[PDB]
Paper text:
Mirolysin is a secretory protease of Tannerella forsythia, a member of the dysbiotic oral microbiota responsible for periodontitis. T. forsythia secretes a family of six multidomain proteases: three serine proteases (mirolase, miropsin-1, and miropsin-2) and three metalloproteases (karilysin, mirolysin, and forsilysin), referred to as KLIKK proteases. Mirolysin, together with other M43B proteases, archetypal ulilysin and human pappalysins (pregnancy-associated plasma proteases) that hydrolyse growth hormone-binding proteins, shares unique specificity for Xaa–Arg and Xaa–Lys (P1–P1′) peptide bonds, and thus is dubbed LysargiNase17. In this study, we show that mirolysin latency is achieved by a “cysteine-switch” mechanism exerted by Cys23 in the N-terminal profragment.
To determine the molecular mechanism of the interaction of cpd 9 with mirolysin, the crystal structure of the inhibitory complex was solved. The obtained data allowed us to solve the structure in the P1 space group, representing six protein molecules in the asymmetric unit. All molecules show evidence of bound cpd 9, represented by electron density in the difference electron-density map (Fo – Fc) close to the active site of the enzyme. Although the coverage of the fragments by electron density differs for the different protein molecules in the presented structure, unambiguous placement of cpd 9 was achieved for each protein molecule in the unit cell. Cpd 9 is inserted deep in the S1′ subsite of the substrate-binding pocket formed by Asp94, Leu181, Tyr216, Arg220, Thr221, His224, Tyr286, Thr287, and Met292. The main binding contributions come from a hydrogen bond between the backbone carbonyl of Thr287 and the primary amine of cpd 9, water-mediated interaction of the cpd 9 primary amine and the Asp289 side chain, and π–π stacking interactions of the Tyr286 side chain and the ring system of the fragment, as well as π–alkyl interaction of Leu181 with the same moiety of cpd 9. As in the case of the product complex of mature mirolysin, Lys at P1′20, the amino group of cpd 9 interacts with Thr287 and Asp289 at the bottom of the S1′ pocket, but additionally, the aromatic ring of cpd 9 interacts with Leu181 and Tyr286 in the walls forming the S1′ subsite. However, in stark contrast to Arg and Lys side chains, cpd 9 does not contain an aliphatic straight-chain, aside from the amine group, but instead contains an aromatic ring, which fits well into the deep and spacious S1′ subsite in the mirolysin substrate-binding pocket. Cpd 9 and cpd 10 inhibited mirolysin with a Ki of 3.2 and 22 µM, respectively.
Author numbering: 59 to 177, 179 to 327
The structure:
Amino acid sequence: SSTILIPVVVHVVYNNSAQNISDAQIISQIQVLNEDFRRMNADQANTPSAFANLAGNANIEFKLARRDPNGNTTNGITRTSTSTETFSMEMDNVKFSNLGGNNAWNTRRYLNIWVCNLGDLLGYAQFPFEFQTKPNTDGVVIHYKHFGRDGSAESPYDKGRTATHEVGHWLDLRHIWGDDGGSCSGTDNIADTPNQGGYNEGCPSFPKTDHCTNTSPGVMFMNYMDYTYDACMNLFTKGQVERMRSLFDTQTGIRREMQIYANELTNP
Ligand SMILES: NCc1cccc2nsnc12
Ligand SMILES: [Ca+2]
Ligand SMILES: [Ca+2]
Ligand SMILES: [Zn+2]
C-alpha cells in the first residue's frame, strides 16, 4: 500500500497558561499518531502473539501543515487566547472563532486537531457520515491534559492515545464492543476484532474474556478503539486499517480530496 499523507493543523485554544501547551508536547502527539498509524509504536511489544498476526500498519503519515489556507508559510500550530473557560461537545464552540474557539482550516484539505479545556471528557471526534451536513466541525478535539506523550500529559491518559482513538473515529472506526451497552448483538463491522460485550477501562490482565468471547485469547482490550488506559493499548487490526484507508479511495472515498494537495500543503 502507498502512504496516505494527512496535513494537520493543531489549534491550541487556551483560557490560561496551563492550556497554552508547549511545541514539544504538540510534536510529541504528531509523533505518536505516526507511530500508531504505521505500527512503529515501541509498545507493539505488548501486543499478545495471539493477536500479532491481526495487527495492521495503516501506512497513514501525519505532517504539520507548512502552507496555511491563504498559501502563506506556517508551522501548522495556531494559538488562540479565549475568554471561554470550558468548551462543550454539544456546542462545538471550540471550532468557531465567533464563539471563542478557532475556525477549521478547509476540512477537505487539513485534519484540524483542537486542544482545549473540555467538560472528565478526554476528547471527541466527528464521523465521516456527518461531513456533508457538518463540514465546519469535521476533525478531532483533545483535552489539553491528555494531548501528547509524557511531558505535561496526565496519567493514566498520557501516551497520546486519546488522539489515536479520535483519529480512528474520524477515519470511520467504531468502538470495538459495538456501542451496545454490554450485549453481544452490536458490531464494529470489523471481522478480525473479536466480538466483545462492553468497553474495558484501566488495564485488564491478558486474556480478558466475557459472555461474547469466553475463550483465550479473549477480547482485544489493547485495541485503540477500546476505553483502556493509554499504556495498555498498542494496535489497530488489518480489518480496521482497510476501513480507514477506504476513505481515501480515489473513486468512492469521502476524504479523497485530502490526498490531492497533501504534499504541497506539507512541503516548504
Ligand atoms: N482510551 C481512549 C479514549 C478516548 C476517548 C475517551 C475515552 N474514555 S476512556 N478511554 C478513552
Ligand atoms: Ca469485530
Ligand atoms: Ca457488545
Ligand atoms: Zn470513542
